């Protein structure tokens, strides 16, 4: 009926990509002593694969590291392993249906391993939120965001986070049925992938077969200066969107 | 030795990224029947990690997949497993010190596993070769190329291929001791990372601490159209480099 218990506590509720997560894994031994092989932490989320017009959600590990190595835990004994790790820059934003979880794996040799799970909210990176606010000012509204299968981009992760906006102005209603953005965040800036009418076209996921028929894709890099510069950001974004008229 | 044998044969020895590699894994049973758990192929290379000014080279897996699952092979028996896979777009170019190998892993249950090794030459993709020709035309000469540890860029692979050029003209000698380019190739175009005087500054690998003090980095995306018109390419590259004349 279980002996040793594990509990992870992060110091904050909210982080954005690039920020340092700090916390502590608390372990308390049970009635009789057990041999602990290691304590691992993982950040994970899920992403969608659509097959034959039905959704499959698949777990994916964003980051993983070892909190501690082997030690023996004796009766009732209390141990604290403090940790820190950096949130990867491709960590998805917690909005819509996207959740990001911190999973603690405490491995017990012979043994039934113990685990913990802590949701973390991942906020939009400042540059990303600048882009988003700029986009909504132009006459758009954020409708959906979800992690979608993206083998086509051959990224570190198997998925990308797809932001789907709906036009709130007559002009953009006329231009498109909806707008799609992918953010690829790096240390020096941000790359944006633009697409339109993906829902209209009944497209899900990002696959080779969508660009084989000579469809092509708008892909634009912004540097830090541009992203922190608000005004010209909205107008360059307007310029990019105008190519869809 | 009358033991179980594996031999992998590719149809070509040379490919560029995005191209399909085809071949066959040939297996021959040894004197005694064995249970084979699987046959895997691995595409791999090595990259440099510098610590305290010493080079350590570390093995890295570019791609991996299962050619076949479990079967029993009888003595002297021959099996052929044909295969195909696509060379990932971040596969490094085989030039300088870079090697790319296809490794066959035949796992035998209890058992001494068998292996094969086939080098492949990975050619510069045409857009990259356009950039390379463009850079040398401006007055550079390609000096070194290697795979370098690069956690800073957080790519799919732990390394990037770093191309180092040496200035061959008075103008560019006056500008720099050397130029460094990183190509990040994708389906719709190509991204170039520019840096100068990394060797002069004794920098190896791409790390957070190199850009924390307010060093900055030139990072520019080119599309397919731009990459395939060579003139406009050299003048764009000339313009990008002009920011270093300062
Ligand atoms: Na917890
Ligand atoms: Na071979």
Swiss-Prot record, chain A:
GO terms for biological process: sporulation resulting in formation of a cellular spore. Gene3D superfamilies: 2.60.40.640. Keywords: Sporulation. Induction: Expression controlled by a sigma-H-regulated promoter which needs the sigma-H factor for the binding of the RNA polymerase and subsequent transcription. Belongs to the spo0M family. Controls the expression of spo0A and is required to pass the morphological stage 0 of sporulation. This is Sporulation-control protein spo0M. It comes from Bacillus subtilis (strain 168). The lineage of its organism: Bacteria, Bacillati, Bacillota, Bacilli, Bacillales.
